Write a protein that binds this ligand. Structure first.
Ligand SMILES: *[C@@H]1O[C@H](CO)[C@@H](O[C@@H]2O[C@H](CO)[C@@H](O[C@@H]3O[C@H](CO[C@H]4O[C@H](CO[C@H]5O[C@H](CO)[C@@H](O)[C@H](O)[C@@H]5O[C@H]5O[C@H](CO)[C@@H](O)[C@H](O)[C@@H]5O)[C@@H](O)[C@H](O[C@H]5O[C@H](CO)[C@@H](O)[C@H](O)[C@@H]5O)[C@@H]4O)[C@@H](O)[C@H](O[C@H]4O[C@H](CO)[C@@H](O)[C@H](O)[C@@H]4O[C@H]4O[C@H](CO)[C@@H](O)[C@H](O)[C@@H]4O[C@H]4O[C@H](CO)[C@@H](O)[C@H](O)[C@@H]4O)[C@@H]3O)[C@H](O)[C@H]2NC(C)=O)[C@H](O)[C@H]1NC(C)=O
Ligand SMILES: *[C@@H]1O[C@H](CO)[C@@H](O[C@@H]2O[C@H](CO)[C@@H](O[C@@H]3O[C@H](CO[C@H]4O[C@H](CO[C@H]5O[C@H](CO)[C@@H](O)[C@H](O)[C@@H]5O)[C@@H](O)[C@H](O[C@H]5O[C@H](CO)[C@@H](O)[C@H](O)[C@@H]5O)[C@@H]4O)[C@@H](O)[C@H](O[C@H]4O[C@H](CO)[C@@H](O)[C@H](O)[C@@H]4O[C@H]4O[C@H](CO)[C@@H](O)[C@H](O)[C@@H]4O[C@H]4O[C@H](CO)[C@@H](O)[C@H](O)[C@@H]4O)[C@@H]3O)[C@H](O)[C@H]2NC(C)=O)[C@H](O)[C@H]1NC(C)=O
Ligand SMILES: *[C@@H]1O[C@H](CO)[C@@H](O[C@@H]2O[C@H](CO)[C@@H](O[C@@H]3O[C@H](CO)[C@@H](O)[C@H](O[C@H]4O[C@H](CO)[C@@H](O)[C@H](O)[C@@H]4O[C@H]4O[C@H](CO)[C@@H](O)[C@H](O)[C@@H]4O)[C@@H]3O)[C@H](O)[C@H]2NC(C)=O)[C@H](O)[C@H]1NC(C)=O
Ligand SMILES: *[C@@H]1O[C@H](CO)[C@@H](O[C@@H]2O[C@H](CO)[C@@H](O[C@@H]3O[C@H](CO)[C@@H](O)[C@H](O)[C@@H]3O)[C@H](O)[C@H]2NC(C)=O)[C@H](O)[C@H]1NC(C)=O
Ligand SMILES: *[C@@H]1O[C@H](CO)[C@@H](O[C@@H]2O[C@H](CO)[C@@H](O[C@@H]3O[C@H](CO)[C@@H](O)[C@H](O)[C@@H]3O)[C@H](O)[C@H]2NC(C)=O)[C@H](O)[C@H]1NC(C)=O
Ligand SMILES: *[C@@H]1O[C@H](CO)[C@@H](O[C@@H]2O[C@H](CO)[C@@H](O)[C@H](O)[C@H]2NC(C)=O)[C@H](O)[C@H]1NC(C)=O
Lengths: 48, 204, 230
């Protein structure tokens, strides 16, 4: 039996640190896909 | 939590005592016999514990919580406190409700008020004692007044106790300075029993 | 399951009050309930003190709850191997005089959300009375109460500040039984005790025939008789 918080497992990511990284990464993709373009992120499509 | 001061009923009748200030369902009621330890008669509102008769039932409507005892008997005579969790983890208790299932018959109290003595004032002390006895039920509130305005200071009141004749008795002690005693002529002592009050007054 | 309180029944003011509960039939290690204390001042309502539990979470080594007012002056402790509960009160005053009960707290303790939520005391102890006094054993001050109804008036003997109990007051050394009464003791704000007595006698007896009460106090070594005149 589970004795404690009734919860589902969870993963924490700091909003500031991920964003800062994202901004630096998204600029690197534009060294290929061109200086100006729209880059959108989305979760997994589907599968196993 | 606000709990009614007193409650009375005859054997076989059903009494419902309330409690307010409970916004949550953590409400619980306790039963404490005089000269004994408190015992939990109910928890989580309606739910009953082990070895507790069905006639005890908890109920909560809105901000008001209520306990109901049907089929009164001798062993039900005690003080009933309510309590509940509030906020994060703190818990508070009410003033408690005193329920008495004593035998008949009802009777008006009897008050005898004694002013300070001559030897006592010489010790630079002044104390007035109200003696209340022969009343039913066994719960009485006492009030003091100096002339007309009431006295809020120096009031010591204790829980009444049963006598040999089965009638309850209590005594309230008012301790003050001899200066305010000689200044104010008359000192009134008000004793409130089941709505009706009995008053006594003494002057030097 | 039995809770046995133990410790000093008499403590001096401003000192440190220490009390220890001995549990029997259950383990303090059990995560099903919290362990703490609830004090009930004489002829007054129930007041919550506090409770704790070693059964912790990922960010703490345990949980400890204090009553906001009593927080500064108290310390709670649990001995898991020895199955004992501790309570320590610093700088104690006569206002802290109460019957202390060893309390087991039930509620959302075994399955909670966020913090644990204890809400009710399922199991109580017998409890002990701790009286806080800044003084020592005291003799009662005896003053007579002069009467004035209904053909028979009432007179009594006043018993002022004393400590500790008891005091036995008899009228004319047990000469009168019928129509004799004695009221219980009262706790003063100074930590002391006080009580009185009353007797009903006819008005025709007033005269050369007088009434004298016999006061007896063992601890302060006090035997005092006083005659009463109106
Ligand atoms: C992923 O990210 C997640 C974030 O997105 C992250 O979640 C965060 O997790 C951390 C921990 O992992 C959380 O931090 C903890 O939070 C606990 C709960 O905090 C809430 O409650 C307190 C208390 O509020 C009551 O008391 C105060 C003061 O009286 C009142 O002002 C309140 O109104 C309220 O009062 C009610 O209740 C009283 C008691 O029942 C009643 O008396 C009263 O009448 C009222 O009914 C609040 O202070 C908190 O507010 C703070 O946060 C909000 C957020 O919006 C702010 O807006 C706000 O300004 C505040 O900053 C909040 O509401 C904390 O208790 C806990 O801190 C305790 O533990 C640390 C351990 O080191 C101690 O150092 C610390 O001193 C605290 O100890 C006390 O409490 C513990 C129990 O928690 C006791 O065991 C201990 O003995 C001590 O108790 C003593 O003090 C008590 C008062 O505090 C007293 O009641 C006791 O009797 C006793 O004397 C810690 O900070 C954080 O909240 C999460 N955040 C979120 C958003 O989820 C997640 O973890 C991440 N995942 C991973 C894997 O990392
Ligand atoms: C998740 O849930 C679990 C429960 O499922 C929680 O686990 C509990 O956590 C608490 C808190 O740590 C534990 O209490 C500790 O107990 C140990 C001793 O544990 C042994 O004995 C226990 C009792 O056994 C007896 O009873 C049982 C039941 O009746 C009976 O069957 C048995 O025969 C015996 O009669 C056992 O239960 C326990 O078993 C556990 O561990 C086994 C592995 O060892 C495991 O197989 C079992 O399944 C079970 O899980 C074990 O045999 C105490 O020593 C300890 O006290 C120290 O630690 C706490 C913090 O943990 C601290 O607050 C204390 O102050 C104290 O720390 C001082 O002393 C240490 C030495 O004793 C010292 O090293 C420290 O540095 C510190 O010393 C300093 O400070 C003090 C003042 O504080 C000072 O005086 C010193 O001089 C010095 O300066 C704990 O009290 C529970 O045992 C444990 N399990 C259960 C079932 O409750 C868990 O907390 C939850 N949360 C998380 C995040 O996991
Ligand atoms: C994943 O988890 C990790 C680990 O928990 C997270 O990384 C930790 O992040 C926290 C907060 O972001 C950080 O905690 C602070 O660390 C400081 C040192 O680096 C401490 O000084 C500070 O303590 C003060 O604040 C606490 C809370 O307010 C108080 O409880 C504490 O007593 C401190 O207060 C003192 O100091 C002040 C002056 O500043 C003084 O006035 C007071 O009197 C008192 O002395 C915080 O605890 C940890 O350091 C981080 N750990 C690491 C290893 O980096 C990470 O953020 C998590 N990620 C996600 C996404 O959730
Ligand atoms: C996403 O990344 C951006 C940067 O591209 C972050 O913006 C940052 O916002 C904080 C305020 O929340 C700025 O801090 C500020 O600093 C100034 C100067 O010291 C001060 O005057 C302000 O009071 C405040 O403290 C920070 O400077 C700024 N970043 C940059 C590079 O300027 C943003 O915070 C990130 N996302 C989130 C979660 O906020
Ligand atoms: C990644 O994020 C997307 C966006 O939320 C998730 O897609 C969501 O998938 C659920 C199915 O599990 C969709 O529910 C469906 O709704 C439609 C419209 O009501 C209905 O016709 C279906 O029968 C079903 O109920 C949900 O709508 C959809 N989100 C959006 C915005 O359309 C996806 O699940 C996420 N991936 C993972 C792995 O979590
Ligand atoms: C999961 O289900 C089992 C029963 O299959 C639970 O075990 C019972 O728990 C109750 C307590 O309410 C006991 O009275 C029974 O004797 C237990 N039976 C058995 C066979 O162990 C179990 O509690 C459930 N999960 C938990 C531990 O919460």
């Amino acid at each position: 039996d589970i004795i404690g918080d009734i919860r589902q497992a969870h993963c924490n990511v700091s909003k500031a640190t991920w964003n800062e990284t994202l901004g630096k990464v998204v600029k690197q993709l534009r060294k290929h896909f061109g200086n100006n373009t729209i880059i959108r992120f989305a979760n997994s499509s589907g599968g196993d | 939590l606000t709990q009614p001061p007193s409650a009375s009923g005859s054997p076989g009748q059903s009494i419902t005592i309330s409690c307010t200030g409970t916004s949550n369902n953590f409400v619980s009621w306790y039963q404490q016999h005089a000269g004994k330890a408190p015992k939990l008669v109910i928890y989580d509102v309606n739910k009953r514990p082990s070895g507790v008769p069905d006639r005890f039932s908890g109920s909560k409507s809105g901000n008001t919580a209520s306990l109901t005892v049907s089929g009164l008997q001798t062993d039900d005579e005690a003080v009933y406190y309510c309590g509940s969790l509030v906020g994060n983890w703190d818990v508070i208790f009410g003033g408690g409700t005193k329920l008495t299932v004593l035998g008949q018959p009802k009777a008006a109290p009897s008050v005898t008020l004694f002013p300070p003595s001559s030897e006592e004032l010489q010790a630079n002390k002044a104390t007035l004692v109200c003696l209340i006895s022969d009343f039913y039920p066994g719960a009485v509130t006492v009030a003091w007044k100096a002339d007309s305005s009431p006295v809020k200071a120096g009031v010591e009141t204790t829980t009444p106790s049963k006598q040999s004749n089965n009638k309850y008795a209590a005594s309230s002690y008012l301790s003050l300075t001899p200066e305010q005693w000689k200044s104010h002529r008359s000192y009134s002592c008000q004793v409130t029993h089941e709505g009706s009050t009995v008053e006594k007054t003494v002057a030097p | 399951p039995q809770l046995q309180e133990s410790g000093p029944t008499l403590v001096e003011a401003s000192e440190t009050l220490s009390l220890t509960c001995a549990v029997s039939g259950d383990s303090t290690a059990a995560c099903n309930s919290f362990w703490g204390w609830v004090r009930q001042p004489p002829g007054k309502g129930l007041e919550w003190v506090g409770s704790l539990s070693h059964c912790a979470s990922y960010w703490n080594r345990g949980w400890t709850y204090h009553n906001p007012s009593l927080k500064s002056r108290l310390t709670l402790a649990l001995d898991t191997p020895k199955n004992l509960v501790f309570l320590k009160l610093n700088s104690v005053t006569a206002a802290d005089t109460a019957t202390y009960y060893c309390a087991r707290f039930g509620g959302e303790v075994l399955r909670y959300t966020d913090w644990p939520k204890p809400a009710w005391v399922d199991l109580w102890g017998r409890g002990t009375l701790v009286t806080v006094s800044s003084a020592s054993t005291k003799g009662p001050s005896v003053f007579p109460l002069a009467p004035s109804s209904g053909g028979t008036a009432a007179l009594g003997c006043l018993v002022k500040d004393y400590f500790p109990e008891p005091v036995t007051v008899s009228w004319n050394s047990g000469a009168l039984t019928s129509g004799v009464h004695t009221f219980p003791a009262v706790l003063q704000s100074s930590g002391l005790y006080s009580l009185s007595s009353v007797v009903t006698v006819p008005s025709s007896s007033l005269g050369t025939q007088t009434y004298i009460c016999n006061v007896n106090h063992k601890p302060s070594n006090t035997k005092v008789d006083k005659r009463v005149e109106p």
